[PDB]
Amino acid sequence: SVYTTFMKSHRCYDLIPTSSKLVVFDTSLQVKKAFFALVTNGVRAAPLWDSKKQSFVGMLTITDFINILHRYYKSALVQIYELEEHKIETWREVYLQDSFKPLVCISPNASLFDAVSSLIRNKIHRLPVIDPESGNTLYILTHKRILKFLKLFITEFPKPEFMSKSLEELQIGTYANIAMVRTTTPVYVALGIFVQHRVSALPVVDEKGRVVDIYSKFDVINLAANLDVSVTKALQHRGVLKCYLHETLEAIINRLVEAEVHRLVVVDEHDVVKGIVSLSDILQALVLT
Amino acid sequence: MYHQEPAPPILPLQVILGISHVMLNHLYALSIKDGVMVLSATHRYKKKYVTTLLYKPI
Amino acid sequence: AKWHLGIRSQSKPNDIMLEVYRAMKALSYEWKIINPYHVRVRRQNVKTGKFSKMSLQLYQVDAKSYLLDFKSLTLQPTGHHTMEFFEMCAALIIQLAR
Ligand SMILES: Nc1ncnc2c1ncn2[C@@H]1O[C@H](COP(=O)(O)OP(=O)(O)OP(=O)(O)O)[C@@H](O)[C@H]1O
Ligand SMILES: Nc1ncnc2c1ncn2[C@@H]1O[C@H](COP(=O)(O)OP(=O)(O)OP(=O)(O)O)[C@@H](O)[C@H]1O
Numbered sequence: 001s002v003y004t005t006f007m008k009s010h011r012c013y014d015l016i017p018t019s020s021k022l023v024v025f026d027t028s029l030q031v032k033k034a035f036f037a038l039v040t041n042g043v044r045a046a047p048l049w050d051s052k053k054q055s056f057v058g059m060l061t062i063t064d065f066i067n068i069l070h071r072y073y074k075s076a077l078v079q080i081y082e083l084e085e086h087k088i089e090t091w092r093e094v095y096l097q098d099s100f101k102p103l104v105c106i107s108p109n110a111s112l113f114d115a116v117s118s119l120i121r122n123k124i125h126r127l128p129v130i131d132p133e134s135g136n137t138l139y140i141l142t143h144k145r146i147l148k149f150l151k152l153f154i155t156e157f158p159k160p161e162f163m164s165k166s167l168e169e170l171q172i173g174t175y176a177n178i179a180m181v182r183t184t185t186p187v188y189v190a191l192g193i194f195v196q197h198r199v200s201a202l203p204v205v206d207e208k209g210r211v212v213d214i215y216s217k218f219d220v221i222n223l224a225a226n227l228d229v230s231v232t233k234a235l236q237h238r239g240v241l242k243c244y245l246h247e248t249l250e251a252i253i254n255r256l257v258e259a260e261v262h263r264l265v266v267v268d269e270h271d272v273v274k275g276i277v278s279l280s281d282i283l284q285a286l287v288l289t
Numbered sequence: 290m291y292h293q294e295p296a297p298p299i300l301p302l303q304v305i306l307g308i309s310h311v312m313l314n315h316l317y318a319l320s321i322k323d324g325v326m327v328l329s330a331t332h333r334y335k336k337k338y339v340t341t342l343l344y345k346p347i
Numbered sequence: 348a349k350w351h352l353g354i355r356s357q358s359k360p361n362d363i364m365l366e367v368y369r370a371m372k373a374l375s376y377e378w379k380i381i382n383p384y385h386v387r388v389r390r391q392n393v394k395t396g397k398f399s400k401m402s403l404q405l406y407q408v409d410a411k412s413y414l415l416d417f418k419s420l421t422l423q424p425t426g427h428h429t430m431e432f433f434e435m436c437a438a439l440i441i442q443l444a445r
Contacts, residue, residue: 130423
């Protein structure tokens with residue numbers, strides 16, 4: 001199509017802004033200390049510089065803190081998670097992370113298309129743009145960044161036919177086996193499922209099955225600073241956005257982009273969740289298709 | 290730099306909170322607190338400017 | 348918020364200078380003096396082979412206070428200029444620090 005062709009014809013360079021900040025951690029940093037630096041700097045992840053390997057080895061993301069919190073839990077040492085001071089290096093090594101899931105990165109010169117496949121194929125959410133000449137991570141590419149850029153084009157240019165069809169027509173998003181919790185569900189349970197399923201967020205639903213909120217991986221680690229608690233109880237320590245299958249692709253995209261969220265919970269007439277539409281979903285359908 | 294053998298110009302930039310104000314390519318840093326050093330520095334790739342921070346331990 | 352440029356020493360410039368030449372020789376850098384308030388310093392990179400380079404410029408900020416300044420020069424790449432910079436500056440400062 002047209003969107004696919006756009007993406008095969010634009011360089012990642014193109015959506016790097018004119019000014020940009022990039023926070024990097026040396027993997028010899030203390031996980032704990034890093035966590036604060038993420039927070040103080042108001043970022044959700046960071047590139048990892050490994051001084052000994054002389055290289056960028058990967059990302060420090062919220063899942064990694066989750067994987068570690070879990071280990072403590074599996075060990076009945078959850079009480080300690082808050083207090084520990086092992087290095088990022090150490091824990092990544094525990095998991096043989098550098099050897100097993102090595103850094104995925106891209107050139108400023110690669111296509112935006114390429115970056116979209118990249119993130120999806122490798123099932124990752126962050127993608128370092130690294131200048132092959134200098135070896136410098138220029139900037140990190142997210143689905144939201146990629147989509148937002150594409151949306152500018154979308155609006156300043158005639159839409160295709162299908163941009164008017166509906167989620168239901170299009171069959172875009174996830175509608176089978178939605179991982180959700182219940183108002184009552186024990187935070188520790190969410191942990192379990194976050195680790196096991198590799199989804200980012202969980203819809204919190206009532207008995208009837210209507211979405212009342214959403215629990216994220218962040219929420220979990222944020223807390224750990226008891227775990228048998230009610231998901232609902234935990235939430236008192238702090239966005240849910242809905243959409244329907246009757247709604248047009250175009251209408252969805254606008255909301256996802258304008259709204260700033262990372263996905264929509266699809267919902268029938270009585271708010272009974274029916275599925276989820278995410279950024280990968282959108283960006284896979286426009287672009288990889 | 291090839292050898293290993295041995296009125297300081299006045300300085301007007303000194304501490305910060307636009308780019309020339311920061312001086313492109315010059316090392317900046319924070320008060321080293323709690324055994325961790327933070328370096329910063331802004332560089333150009335073609336038309337773009339990335340200001341990189343490195344969080345490093347001692 | 349409190350971002351300081353370079354590093355601030357109060358020792359005497361010639362002294363300062365020597366301290367750096369000493370550090371560098373310890374850190375095993377080679378330099379080219381451009382003058383008693385500027386040196387071009389370089390560091391071989393053993394894993395890589397390639398070199399990293401940077402500029403030292405001494406300033407006066409007060410009358411009893413000085414300022415030493417660091418400036419950079421020129422499938423993952425082996426070689427990461429910005430990181431190798433930071434590392435070169437760090438090693439020195441640490442060496443100097445004590
Ligand atoms: N470019 C990359 N190369 C290699 N591994 C990566 C990369 N980006 C993320 N990871 C790893 O993938 C796992 C999932 O992180 P990812 O960013 O995909 O989801 P997340 O934990 O929800 O983070 P985010 O807030 O970015 O979504 C983590 O273990 C992370 O370290
Ligand atoms: N709670 C959930 N249960 C089941 N599937 C989900 C859930 N949340 C998302 N998904 C589906 O899993 C895939 C990954 O969704 P997720 O939101 O983690 O990734 P993404 O949207 O591509 O990343 P980002 O959130 O950064 O856009 C998507 O195809 C989505 O439809």
